[PDB]
């Protein structure tokens, strides 16, 4: 879980 | 009882908190004129396409016009930035983590060593094909001429080092493993905390560490996993920071810093 991501 | 904004200001004035870690987002950049990244115009399958690599390869013009607007020199820091600058000058800032890509933190005078631009920067660029690094200045002209930078080696598209969705975060981000456990106060200014892994950093502090949120809304982990020493100053981010500055006794020292650092930029 180190990669950029939006909650959606 | 429960902690208030006045109690946290009292803790800062008593120098009980000297390892302040700060998290900021778009809420502190909108008062400076920075446009909302969801609502463009000051070409959207969905709002996040502007920062998505497949679309960028399909059509990179939208991202590079937004950059021409956000590139250094155009906008100027505001009161929230210069408050954080004052925290640093007074030896209270352990580190400032930001999701913003306008570079206003650096322009306000916060040294890079105390700063973690967790979502990248326009100061550096990288070719999308051969990964060759490039100084951000080497491609500035192209963006001002509304061009698309191209690698002088393989002719691939050169992308400013803005962290897109799916991309890893920069390596200075990994300073969070040591900073947040070392922090004695966590300030959260103007962010919805909807982007990860940045947003999860609110939980990386210890339960004995106060967490002060100045944001229009109680958002994210602070709403569903509340803590005893959490404080929420809900409302406009500028007014909230100015209320804290007055409670701290820094109003006039701020008024000196804001007028001198602004005139420096002519
Ligand atoms: Zn290349």
Numbering used by the authors:
A (entry chain B): 20 to 27
B (entry chain A): 121 to 162, 172 to 395
Please quote the paper that reports this structure.
Crystals of H3K23la(L)-SIRT3 and H4K16la(L)-SIRT3 complexes diffracted to 2.0 Å and 2.5 Å resolution, respectively. Each structure contains 1 SIRT3 molecule, 1 zinc atom, and 1 lactyl peptide in each asymmetric unit. The catalytic pocket of SIRT3 displayed half-hydrophobic and half-hydrophilic characters. In both structures, F180, I230, I291, and V292 of SIRT3 formed a preconfigured hydrophobic cage that accommodated the hydrocarbon portion of the lactyl group. Several water molecules participated in the hydrogen bond network to facilitate the interaction between the hydroxyl group of the Kla and Q228, N229, H248 of SIRT3 in SIRT3-H4K16la(L) structure. Furthermore, a water bridge network involving Q228, N229, and H248 of SIRT3 stabilizes the hydroxyl group of lactyl-lysine. The fitted curve calculated KM = 142.66 ± 2.64 μM, Vmax = 0.925 ± 0.101 μmol/L/min, kcat = 0.08 ± 0.008 s−1, kcat/KM = 5.40∗102 s−1M−1. Knocking down either SIRT3 or HDAC3 increased cellular H4K16la level. The binding affinity of SIRT3 to lactylated D-lysine peptide was also found to be approximately 2-fold higher than that of lactylated L-lysine peptide. Hence, the probe p-H4K16laAlk validated that H4K16la is the substrate of SIRT3 in cellualr environment.
